[PDB]
Design an enzyme around this catalytic site. Structure first.
Site, PDB file in Angstrom:
ATOM      1  N   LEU A  73      45.822  40.585  36.812  1.00 36.25           N
ATOM      2  CA  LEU A  73      45.774  39.727  37.617  1.00 36.25           C
ATOM      3  C   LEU A  73      44.514  39.536  38.486  1.00 36.25           C
ATOM      4  CD1 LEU A  73      49.318  40.773  39.179  1.00 36.25           C
ATOM      5  CD2 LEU A  73      48.746  39.140  37.404  1.00 36.25           C
ATOM      6  N   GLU A  74      44.357  38.195  38.680  1.00 34.70           N
ATOM      7  CA  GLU A  74      43.235  37.792  39.793  1.00 34.70           C
ATOM      8  C   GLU A  74      43.465  38.426  41.087  1.00 34.70           C
ATOM      9  OE1 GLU A  74      42.661  33.663  40.106  1.00 34.70           O
ATOM     10  OE2 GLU A  74      44.636  33.234  39.371  1.00 34.70           O
ATOM     11  N   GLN A  75      42.512  38.495  41.823  1.00 38.24           N
ATOM     12  CA  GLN A  75      42.766  38.842  43.160  1.00 38.24           C
ATOM     13  C   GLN A  75      43.788  38.393  44.077  1.00 38.24           C
ATOM     14  OE1 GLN A  75      39.186  39.107  45.633  1.00 38.24           O
ATOM     15  NE2 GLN A  75      40.250  40.280  47.101  1.00 38.24           N
TER      16      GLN A  75
END
Ligand code: NA
Ligand code: NA
Length: 323
Positions: free
Chosen positions: A130-132
């Site tokens: 996942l992206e931040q």
């Protein structure tokens, strides 16, 4: 396909479902065929399962980039080939701009989609990458583990070990950090974790006797590797515990692949890894962003010439098996 899982050490590399990515230093990442990927990457992570357009719904999927000029059929065959070589092909969930914002109740549909893609393409498992902004978006911390438990259990029923891995950015692995719900929910379901020890600038740890050790300090890289890994595999120095047999050290392939974190001198890794082995806590392997970068070019169009897998493939594959 046939689920093909990893019982020994791994060298993990991501594979870009896109062509001609620009690098942090102006270089280029080609799209490459799976069959061209160096065979010493025995886990290859297809990047990314995502939402393409929210008008299609909340549940991410995978669509093979037509620019890559493989038919579905040819891609599928290339996965079968890797599997026959004893190599795993995971689907990597997330990435930049993935629009993954799941709501409680979505775990059934997400599990169904993972199973569908697995059975169709012959994926061997899933990597949570996942992206931040996604790590705590909506109900992701609940939905994504709930779905993956149901997937694991589905394949366990037919004697198959559907691999579950994750690629947290290392700062999120402090005790009670943002990635810890994924780790605790999926403890006993995940095969190994490959954190990203890159793109975190000056984040690091303080060690008495040494000082402040930053992820971007190329003079203290052995110390960074050894101490961040020792912390994780023991649950010390305010890090969440990840057992050593389940920790894989994630790295940029070169200076184009990430802003910071590239290991200038591979001997710093060799020595850190040998110190962890000597205390009875050898790591499970390494991971890189990305095989495309390892096969890419600098800004002057000079090939990176697979330097990452040259530096680390034999080093890892010639270690003793886990346990
Ligand atoms: Na497979
Ligand atoms: Na040094």
């Amino acid at each position: 396909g046939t689920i093909t899982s990893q019982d020994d050490n791994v060298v993990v590399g991501y594979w870009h479902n896109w062509c001609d990515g620009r690098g942090y230093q102006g270089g280029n990442a080609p799209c490459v065929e799976l069959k061209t990927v160096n065979p010493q990457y025995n886990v290859v992570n297809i990047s990314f399962m995502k939402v393409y357009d929210i008008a299609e719904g909340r549940i991410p999927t995978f669509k093979l980039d037509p620019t890559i000029a493989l038919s579905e059929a040819e891609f599928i065959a290339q996965i079968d080939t890797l599997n026959s070589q004893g190599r795993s092909v995971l689907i990597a969930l997330g990435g930049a701009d993935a629009h993954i914002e799941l709501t409680r109740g979505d775990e059934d549909a997400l599990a169904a989609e993972i199973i569908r893609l697995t059975d169709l393409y012959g994926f061997d498992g899933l990597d949570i990458d996942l992206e931040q902004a996604a790590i705590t978006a909506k109900d992701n911390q609940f939905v994504i583990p709930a779905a993956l438990k149901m997937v694991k259990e589905h394949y366990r029923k037919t004697g198959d070990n559907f691999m579950i891995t994750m690629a947290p950015e290392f700062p999120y692995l402090t005790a009670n950090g943002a990635y810890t719900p994924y780790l605790t929910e999926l403890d006993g379901y995940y095969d190994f974790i490959n954190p990203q020890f890159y793109n975190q600038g000056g984040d690091g740890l303080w060690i008495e006797g040494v000082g402040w050790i930053a992820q971007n300090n190329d003079a203290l890289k052995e110390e960074f590797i050894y101490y961040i890994a020792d912390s994780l595999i023991n649950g010390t120095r305010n890090y969440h515990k990840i057992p050593h047999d389940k920790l894989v050290f994630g790295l940029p392939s070169n200076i184009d692949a990430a802003a910071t974190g590239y290991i200038q001198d591979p001997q710093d890794l060799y020595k850190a890894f040998d110190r962890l082995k000597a205390q009875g806590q050898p790591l499970r392997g390494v991971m890189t962003w990305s095989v495309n970068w390892d096969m890419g070019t600098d800004a002057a169009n000079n090939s990176y010439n697979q330097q990452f897998i040259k530096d680390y493939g034999n080093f890892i594959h010639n270690q003793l098996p886990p346990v």
